[PDB]
Design an enzyme around this catalytic site. Structure first.
Site, PDB file in Angstrom:
ATOM      1  N   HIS C 150       0.795  -1.222   0.000  1.00  0.00           N
ATOM      2  CA  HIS C 150       0.000   0.000   0.000  1.00  0.00           C
ATOM      3  C   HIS C 150       0.830   1.275   0.000  1.00  0.00           C
ATOM      4  CE1 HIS C 150      -3.934  -1.711   0.141  1.00  0.00           C
ATOM      5  NE2 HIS C 150      -3.753  -2.320   1.297  1.00  0.00           N
TER       6      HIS C 150
HETATM    7 ZN   LIG Z   1      -5.263  -6.278   3.254  1.00  0.00          ZN
END
Ligand SMILES: [Zn+2]
Ligand SMILES: [K+]
Ligand SMILES: [K+]
Ligand SMILES: [K+]
Ligand SMILES: [K+]
Ligand SMILES: [Zn+2]
Lengths: 138, 613, 385, 393
Positions: C150
């Protein structure tokens, strides 16, 4: 006075603590092992080969190479074993005091531990020894 | 205290229950100030009104403004007692948000990726050669635009026991963190203390260790020491060993070595509870359907909810009618009854309840059994002798005017029961049970094939006799439902037996007992509300006939309305006998009772008839 | 083009064997994100313990990568962000409240004692694994401390500060001409897809739950820009999906891309927030249904990297990671747990199983069908390596 | 689960060779129970003679082991028992009339001159064999003066006064998880089984004759108590069993024990009252039939400790022990005995043979099928849990 059963309570605590201590050290030993699994096999092989044999000079050189390559990890093992041993000796002294105070108290009754008197058997013994002593008196 | 053992005491009551006596004076002053008895009486009226959680706090302070606003110090005393803080705000500007998208919108390609504006904001990276500069790229960026979902669904939500498990996990992780940190700090302090022991008595006095001590993430030790002493008297010590490491860290270490031992024993003593608390909660958290539905239709099979359902269909029908598109609605609820054997099957359970129940005297129990049998046979038009023979053959293989049971339209294929609430309630209870049973029966054949095809877990059902033989599975469900209704089987056994044996596709029966308890009490209140007795009488008089005119249909509606007030509503339950289609209409009082007009002259007839009386 | 099929059990192929490099660092487990924060590195430590008592070290080579240096971290990220990461600290946070909002560090991604240590440990594990996969020394590099998919080029999202996966992939790109990223986390792999968006030398495929779900990206028509057009693939699923359904979605698409895109190596993100009983996810896969994906990509025979990731119920992801580590050595582990020290975490039965619940499934054959057929429709230009 | 077959020529397999350590002490033959007693240690000496004169000493190493000490005896026996053994002589028996009554002494187990010394020799040989096996020196370790398997922790029973096999297995267990004990006497090996009954680390396996016999124990349904349940195997048999029968019963039992129990140190009692012509036993075994057991237990390849036992016709024990010892060295001997100082005792044709009789075999394919099926059933609860890494035993 009353009987708060302290022996058996400390014994329960001890026996619960015993297996938690050990497993950390066992995993440490398993971690030490994982380095010595491509060194110990071929070392054992070359040692048994040299034991049951112009090239032997190179063989002995290889064996010393592997020996002092593998030397550092053999002190880890005995260090870990020594701290493990000290921990478990602490636990063992704890246990033994709890046990002896349970028995010295009556958290285990002394008719339930060392059995009954005259025990319907044991008439054979009294007959035999009575006859021995009787004709000893005769 | 030697001879007697020790006992836990009941409890010490909380503190906020027994501290009241200094304020009991102010209220006499308030009584003196208001003077009159009736104003004081409505004052106490609103006080109790609040103490029963009926009105808010600000509204209470406003009502006491209507009374004691005349005195400023008294009103400020009251204001601060209830903690009514001043809402000193008339000048409030609803200010804008700082963030959402102040800066970014340009040429956008695809749904969720837009070009970065071409500007020399170029931050140079170091490690990039030509390759990393050509494969990695930075022109386009992805930004969420939660574009309406172009759909609609519900969101998953956690079962009640999953959360208990999550909280247990977090509790034990926190215990482990504290004990591991205490150990590691013990190690560092031990190294230091060993450096300090073997010295000369003057290199001690001037020894100082800088913040950190050799811990790359140092704060832990301070944290640990705080938690050992406190957060008031802990900075004092954390600094006293930052300036005297020679005399004040064989004392901070001898105590960490107590807290380690004690905190691990505490972890053990509470792992006992953690362990006993997990066998119970774990297995009943893997059944989400059988635990959601249980509460859902424990609290949704109530009078309010189904009324609201049908009235919702009514209101959206009529507001769609306000829209020109659709002409007009005919009816609201539709039911089909393809298999009629289930009817007797419901009786299989129905009075099976009453034979066990104690809340009724056996005579009126015979009476409401008569209610059920005669009512089903007359409404759904299956012979009473058929239910007779089903009853007899049932206990063989498992081995009368209805008025005092309780006490031009030719070719009559349709029959209308114009009912008040209780009749509607009882009827759709029946209808719910019937449809859920028919759904559980339709696939019973391949259910038998399931249980047989499973060739050799839970050994209990084995010794219990709760497994499923290659028998008729649907009839076995009947049998087990009887078993639990009469109490032959506590709940969880029924539960897991049905679950594994049949499938998890039979949760809708896990509550069957309760729902039958809903129709042996509503039918009993049918015979004890005399007005509903009049309703059923008029119904059977209108139904036992074979031919009548629509004028007598209006007459029927009229003096069935006679027995129910203006506030009460009515529902017309039409039943057509050819296909057993049962429709329900939600009828308001003065408007028309029955089917809307097909053409207009039938309701020319309606006009003349309804305005003729 | 979606065909329902049951789930036949896991079968280890002996016709392919490989040498497994499994990196680890015995310090990663002393860094705690916070007090109640969901992410734990304790996770990784737990998995290690199980691997150590199943004797899996007798079949693979444990290493300890060298913590990456700032001039590697600066291949993907920017210098200002790496500096800020090396300087920021819970001790001196206020003095930074300017850049602390430019780099997202402080709101949801907290600061803790030694986050730079953890970031370096992860990046180093992954870069060493990729380096040794380029130098023929092994066939499978396993790093359960990586998988922070992320993180952005200049920002920290979803507890992911450093995006070590992009580093590992840039490394694999020095030797192989094409790579394939495969993300089976319940969340979209936004960072890697954003990093590699307009190139064709990497193809990305994610199996994520779409809708009103963090991070809000990953829609069916996001297929990359310009050169990397058709070289991105997103599979938006829905709640409740189970092993048979997930398998019938997973195997055909993976097979199609391996037949058409012709990759030289594969990276696999094995997040455990797509299991049953998670804390932040709503799928319903079981242990075997998860491990099946790893098995089915292993049976293709190419260089594979296996990085960890999400998963926020500790015992479930520990068991699952240990089971996939067993089945990487062509083994199937017994279903009892050996007494390790994290034993009481595994009540009430103490077995090697992750059981699904009877949660409702929402993916209907029509949905999966049109999804897969239009994916296959847009995949007809991914043909030449 | 038993099909009868013919008895195949005993033959040494060349893929494995051992390092035999043979233990002998020139004193042992010099002790005698009394006038008419069937127990004669002299036969051990006789066997030694053949070993010397056949040229068999030249491939093994022959050692005297130091006698065992009182406190090595009290690892299994009580203090009162061992103190009695040490203090009692054929001359002062009148002053121990209680203890003799109390420790089962006087007719079947008398007191002779040299009782304690004989016991010391037996125990010492057994414990030194075990210790040398632990140190990785030898593979097989032979001690024919030991194997007095009928002795009780507090009692003399059945010509035996000290259980040296218990001490040997106690020393073998310091370094080994699991030890197998095989007992092919004609009596039941009851001292060792009573000693290791409630444990799982010693598996005892007896092949005996159950009837109106001695000691009276060891049924097919006696399989262990406590955590030792299923860790005691009995094979009761009837009169007359011969080589083919015995081999077809003996091989599959032992092979299934080896596959399941996976032990990795075998002790083997090689008693000789189970030979044709013995004066107390009642089997009809040849010398090849009695030696094929040894050959089979050796064909597995784990540390063996061979000991003596019974044998009450001296000639036949001497010959079968010498033949077995030749077989442990991968040598099938020759049938003509060499001249030795006992060139009597071997009438009438002076050969290396033990001859069977024609007496009738009272054991038939259904009794044996039933016994072996019960055993194969009892013998599947004795494996190791799946996660337990071994050392390839
Ligand atoms: Zn996740
Ligand atoms: K994903
Ligand atoms: K791509
Ligand atoms: K025997
Ligand atoms: K035993
Ligand atoms: Zn015997």
């Amino acid at each position: 006075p009353a009987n708060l059963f302290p022996g058996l309570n400390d014994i329960t605590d001890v026996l619960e603590e015993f297996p938690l201590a050990t497993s950390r050290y066992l995993t440490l030993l398993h971690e030490i092992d994982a380095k010595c699994v491509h060194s110990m096999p071929n070392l054992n092989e070359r040692i048994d080969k040299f034991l049951k044999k112009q090239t032997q000079v190179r063989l002995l050189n290889n064996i010393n190479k592997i020996y002092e390559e593998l030397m550092p990890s053999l002190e880890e093992k005995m260090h870990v074993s020594s701290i493990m041993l000290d921990n478990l000796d602490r636990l063992t002294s704890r246990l033994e005091l709890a046990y002896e105070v349970a028995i010295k108290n009556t958290e285990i009754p002394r008719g339930l531990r060392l059995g009954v008197d005259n025990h319907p058997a044991m008439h054979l013994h009294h007959e035999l020894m009575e006859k021995i002593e009787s004709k000893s008196n005769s | 205290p030697s001879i007697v053992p020790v006992v836990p005491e009941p409890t010490e009551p909380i503190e906020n229950n027994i501290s009241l006596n200094e304020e009991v004076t102010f209220f006499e002053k308030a009584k003196r100030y208001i003077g009159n008895k009736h104003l004081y009486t409505e004052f106490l009226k609103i006080l109790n009104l609040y103490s029963q959680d009926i009105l808010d706090l600000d509204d209470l302070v406003e009502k006491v403004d209507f009374y004691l606003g005349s005195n400023k110090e008294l009103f400020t005393w009251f204001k601060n007692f209830v903690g009514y803080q001043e809402k000193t705000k008339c000048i409030e500007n609803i200010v804008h948000e700082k963030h959402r998208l102040d800066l970014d919108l340009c040429e956008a390609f695809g749904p969720s990726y837009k070009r970065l504006p071409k500007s020399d904001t170029f931050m140079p990276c170091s490690g990039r050669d030509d390759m990393c500069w050509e494969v990695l790229n930075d022109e386009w960026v992805g930004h969420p635009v939660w574009a309406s979902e172009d759909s609609g669904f519900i969101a998953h939500r956690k079962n009640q026991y999953e959360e208990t498990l999550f909280k247990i996990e977090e509790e034990r992780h926190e215990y482990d963190f504290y004990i591991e940190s205490n150990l590691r700090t013990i190690q560092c302090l031990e190294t230091i203390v060993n450096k300090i022991e073997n010295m000369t008595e003057n290199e001690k006095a001037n020894f100082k260790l800088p913040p950190g001590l050799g811990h790359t993430s140092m704060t832990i030790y301070k944290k640990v020491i705080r938690k050992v002493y406190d957060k008031e008297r802990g900075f004092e010590i954390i600094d006293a060993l930052h300036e005297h490491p020679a005399v004040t860290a064989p004392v901070v270490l001898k105590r960490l070595k107590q807290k380690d031992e004690e905190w691990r024993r505490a972890q053990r003593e509470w792992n006992k509870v953690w362990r006993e608390l997990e066998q119970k909660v774990f297995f009943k958290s893997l059944d989400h359907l059988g635990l959601t539905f249980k509460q859902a239709d424990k609290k949704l099979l109530t009078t309010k909810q189904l009324i609201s359902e049908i009235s919702s269909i009514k209101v959206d029908q009529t507001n769609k009618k306000i829209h020109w598109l659709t002409p007009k609605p005919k009816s609201q609820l539709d039911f089909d009854f393809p298999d009629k054997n289930i009817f007797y099957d419901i009786l299989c359970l129905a009075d099976t309840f009453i034979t066990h129940t104690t809340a009724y005297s056996n005579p009126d129990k015979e009476r409401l059994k008569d209610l059920l049998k005669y009512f089903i046979s007359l409404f759904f038009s299956i012979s009473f002798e058929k239910i007779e023979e089903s009853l007899y053959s049932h206990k063989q293989n498992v081995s009368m005017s209805l008025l005092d049971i309780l006490h031009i339209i030719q070719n009559r294929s349709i029959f209308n029961l114009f009912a008040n609430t209780n009749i509607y309630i009882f009827f759709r209870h029946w209808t719910t049970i019937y449809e859920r049973l028919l759904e559980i029966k339709q696939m019973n054949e391949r259910v038998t094939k399931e249980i047989n095809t499973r060739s050799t877990l839970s050994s209990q059902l084995s010794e219990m006799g709760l497994d499923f033989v290659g028998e008729d599975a649907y009839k076995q469900v009947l049998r087990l439902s009887r078993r639990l209704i009469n109490g032959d089987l506590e709940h969880q056994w029924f539960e897991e037996s049905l679950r594994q044996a049949y499938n998890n596709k039979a949760f809708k029966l896990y509550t069957i007992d309760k729902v039958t308890q809903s129709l042996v009490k509503h039918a009993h209140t049918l015979m004890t509300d005399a007005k509903t007795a009049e309703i059923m009488a008029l119904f059977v008089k209108d139904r036992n006939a074979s031919t009548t005119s629509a004028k007598d249909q209006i007459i029927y509606r009229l003096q069935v309305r006679s027995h129910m007030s203006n506030t009460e509503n009515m529902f017309r339950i039409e039943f057509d006998k050819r296909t057993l289609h049962v429709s329900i209409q939600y009828i308001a009082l003065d408007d028309l009772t029955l089917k809307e007009p097909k053409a207009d002259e039938d309701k020319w007839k309606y006009y003349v008839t309804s305005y003729a009386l | 083009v979606y065909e329902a099929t049951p789930f036949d059990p896991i079968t280890v192929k002996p016709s392919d064997k490989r040498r497994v490099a499994y990196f680890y660092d015995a310090d990663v487990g002393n860094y705690a994100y916070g007090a109640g924060h969901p992410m734990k590195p304790h996770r990784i430590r737990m998995a290690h313990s199980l691997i150590m008592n199943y004797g899996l070290y007798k079949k693979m080579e444990i290493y300890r990568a060298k913590p990456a240096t700032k001039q590697e971290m600066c291949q993907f990220h920017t210098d200002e962000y790496i500096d800020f990461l090396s300087r920021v600290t819970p001790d001196n946070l206020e003095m930074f409240k300017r850049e602390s909002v430019k780099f997202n560090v402080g709101d949801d991604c907290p600061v803790f004692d030694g986050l730079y240590e953890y970031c370096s440990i992860s990046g180093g594990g992954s870069m060493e694994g990729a380096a040794r996969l380029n130098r023929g020394k092994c066939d499978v590099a396993v790093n359960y401390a990586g998988g922070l998919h992320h993180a952005k080029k200049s920002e920290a999202s979803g507890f992911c500060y450093l995006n070590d996966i992009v580093l590992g992939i840039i490394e694999l790109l020095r030797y192989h001409p094409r790579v394939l990223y495969i993300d089976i986390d319940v969340h979209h792999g936004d960072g890697v897809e954003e990093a590699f968006y307009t190139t064709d030398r990497v193809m990305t495929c994610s199996f994520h739950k779409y809708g009103e779900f963090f991070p809000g990206t990953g829609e069916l028509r996001d297929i990359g820009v310009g050169a990397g057009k058709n070289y991105a693939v997103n599979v938006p699923l829905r709640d409740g999906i189970d092993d048979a359904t997930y398998r019938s979605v997973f195997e055909p698409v993976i097979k199609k891309i391996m037949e058409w895109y012709q990759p030289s190596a594969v990276v696999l993100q094995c997040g455990g927030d797509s299991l049953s009983g998670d804390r932040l996810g709503c799928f319903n896969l079981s242990m075997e249904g998860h491990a099946n994906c790893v098995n089915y990509v292993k049976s293709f025979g190419i260089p594979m990297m296996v990085v960890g990731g999400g998963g926020y119920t500790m015992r479930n992801v520990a068991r699952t990671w240990c089971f996939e580590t067993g089945l990487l050595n062509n083994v199937v582990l017994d279903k009892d747990l050996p007494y390790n020290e994290y034993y009481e975490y595994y009540g009430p039965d103490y077995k090697l199983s992750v059981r699904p619940s009877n949660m409702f499934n929402v993916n209907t054959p029509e949905y999966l069908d049109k999804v897969m057929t239009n994916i296959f429709a847009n995949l007809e230009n991914t043909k030449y390596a």
